[PDB]
Amino acid sequence: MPTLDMALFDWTDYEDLKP
Amino acid sequence: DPCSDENGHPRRCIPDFVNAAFGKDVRVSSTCGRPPARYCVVSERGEERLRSCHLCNASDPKKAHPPAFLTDLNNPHNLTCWQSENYLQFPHNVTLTLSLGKKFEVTYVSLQFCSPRPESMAIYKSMDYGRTWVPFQFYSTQCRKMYNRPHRAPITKQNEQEAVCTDSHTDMRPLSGGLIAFSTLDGRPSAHDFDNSPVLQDWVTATDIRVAFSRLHTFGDENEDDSELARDSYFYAVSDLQVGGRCKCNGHAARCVRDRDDSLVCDCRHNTAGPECDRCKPFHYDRPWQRATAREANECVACNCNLHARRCRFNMELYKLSGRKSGGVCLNCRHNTAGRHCHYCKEGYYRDMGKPITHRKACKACDCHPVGAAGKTCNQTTGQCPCKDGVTGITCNRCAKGYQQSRSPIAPCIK
Ligand SMILES: *[C@@H]1O[C@H](CO)[C@@H](O[C@@H]2O[C@H](CO)[C@@H](O[C@@H]3O[C@H](CO)[C@@H](O)[C@H](O)[C@H]3NC(C)=O)[C@H](O)[C@H]2NC(C)=O)[C@H](O)[C@H]1NC(C)=O
Ligand SMILES: *[C@@H]1O[C@H](CO)[C@@H](O[C@@H]2O[C@H](CO)[C@@H](O)[C@H](O)[C@H]2NC(C)=O)[C@H](O)[C@H]1NC(C)=O
Ligand SMILES: *[C@@H]1O[C@H](CO)[C@@H](O[C@@H]2O[C@H](CO)[C@@H](O)[C@H](O)[C@H]2NC(C)=O)[C@H](O)[C@H]1NC(C)=O
Ligand SMILES: [Ca+2]
């Protein structure tokens, strides 16, 4: 039902994994 | 078809015994007519010897005497003889060599002469195509002097392959139509027991047959004015050369046949291959090759690659781990399948069921959620990616019951 929101993640650390 | 029974199932088959020489080109060291030259036929009636003379002319078929006449059809009232050049006495050796290019079991060798027979001659086999020559039999009036063998040496268990020499069948006398005829098992102690005699199994096996005429008879007079014509009376000539036997195919053929290369080869069956039928045909390597036996056909079987691999290879480990049933290993296994028989999906793919195992699109790609699942590799069946803590779904793209999303990509479901 509620899928994973990609926008919600804070990527400031782990800069490189962002899809 | 003797190679399978009344039902479908294979059985040991052996080809037929034949004149292996018939119609074959025999290679000869000598043939009159190039250039053309006179020969004389000598006959005797009691006190007198009569002599007719003739031209050997190679370039004229009505006066030629080529090798083809050794293996042609022998009509007893239209005889055709190959004829050697005149007076090749000693040490001159004149030879008829029959190369079968294929292993045969030889049972006899027969010659029929249109001249007086040789004083001394030898039959040889080769087991290795051209290369080496071994003796089957000698014929001479001087065995020790001519061939360094003793006269009528008795054949014995100790050496059952003994090339005997003998003064039998050496008489100048039948001035034509003389018949020499070697039989391979004649004399041999274990011939009665031949099919259980490895010594004799070898003995009869040969690829080639050489016949060497080493010295020729002359008359007790040989007149002085007869010098040219007496010289022109001495030659070797044969009307019919036979080699009885059968092809050696290893229980996997009932026929031998000339092929693509017009070279003699087994018409090879039971999914076997090669000229002797001694190995397996492409894509038939699930069990290792064998001579078909009395009890068992030993047809080598078709390896299974679930319609994914073009080639396959035998492996003993796999073969041994099954109860000696299957050992085929498919290769460069296409369409994102892998394995022995290409029966399961390549790591990081999973089987699109419904679409059957054999189909080109029977493995769909894995495609895990790039932050939800821990790993790229799904389950081969069900395609379930390996989900992180508090993630579920085949793609691992939703938190579980109990879990909310997080702000961190590392641990993205939390409680
Ligand atoms: C045994 O002796 C025969 C006579 O007793 C020899 O004669 C040969 O007969 C052949 C027929 O089978 C001839 O062929 C024909 O003749 C010429 C070819 O040059 C032409 O008129 C024809 O085209 C041909 N055949 C056909 C079907 O149209 C041979 O020419 C002739 N002579 C030879 C070969 O010297 C045989 O030689 C001999 N042995 C056999 C037949 O095996
Ligand atoms: C040997 O070869 C042939 C006969 O077998 C002869 O040559 C042919 O015959 C004529 C004359 O008889 C020649 O003119 C031709 O050159 C030949 N070919 C033909 C007709 O096609 C030849 O005479 C014989 N040789 C000897 C030396 O007797
Ligand atoms: C004729 O054939 C004989 C065989 O009977 C040849 O024999 C060779 O002869 C010498 C002695 O002269 C031996 O030392 C060799 O071992 C023999 N070898 C072979 C393969 O037979 C002989 O040379 C021949 N001669 C000619 C001119 O052909
Ligand atoms: Ca003949």
Numbering used by the authors:
A (entry chain B): 225 to 243
B (entry chain A): 39 to 453
Copy out sentences from the published article reporting this entry, exactly as the authors wrote them.
We show that Draxin is largely unstructured, but that it uses a small C-terminal domain (Draxin-C) to bind DCC N-terminal Ig domains and an upstream conserved peptide motif (Draxin-22) to bind Netrin-1. Netrin-1 and DCC bind to adjacent sites on Draxin, which appears to capture Netrin-1 and tether it to the DCC receptor. We propose the conformational flexibility of the single-pass membrane receptor DCC is used to promote fasciculation and regulate axon guidance through concerted Netrin-1/Draxin binding.
Just upstream of the rDraxin-C domain, there is a conserved region of 22 amino acids that interacts with Netrin-1 (Gao et al., 2015). The structure reveals that the hDraxin-22 peptide binds hNetrin-1 at the same location as the FN5 domain of DCC. The hDraxin-22 peptide uses a hydrogen bonding network to align Phe233Draxin in the same position as Val848DCC from DCC, and Leu228Draxin in the same position as Met933DCC. In the structure of hNetrin-1/hDraxin-22, the same Q433netrin forms two hydrogen bonds to the main chain of Draxin to orient Phe233Draxin and Leu228Draxin for binding. The buried surface area is very similar between the Draxin/Netrin-1 interface (605 Å2) and the Netrin-1/DCC interface (609 Å2).
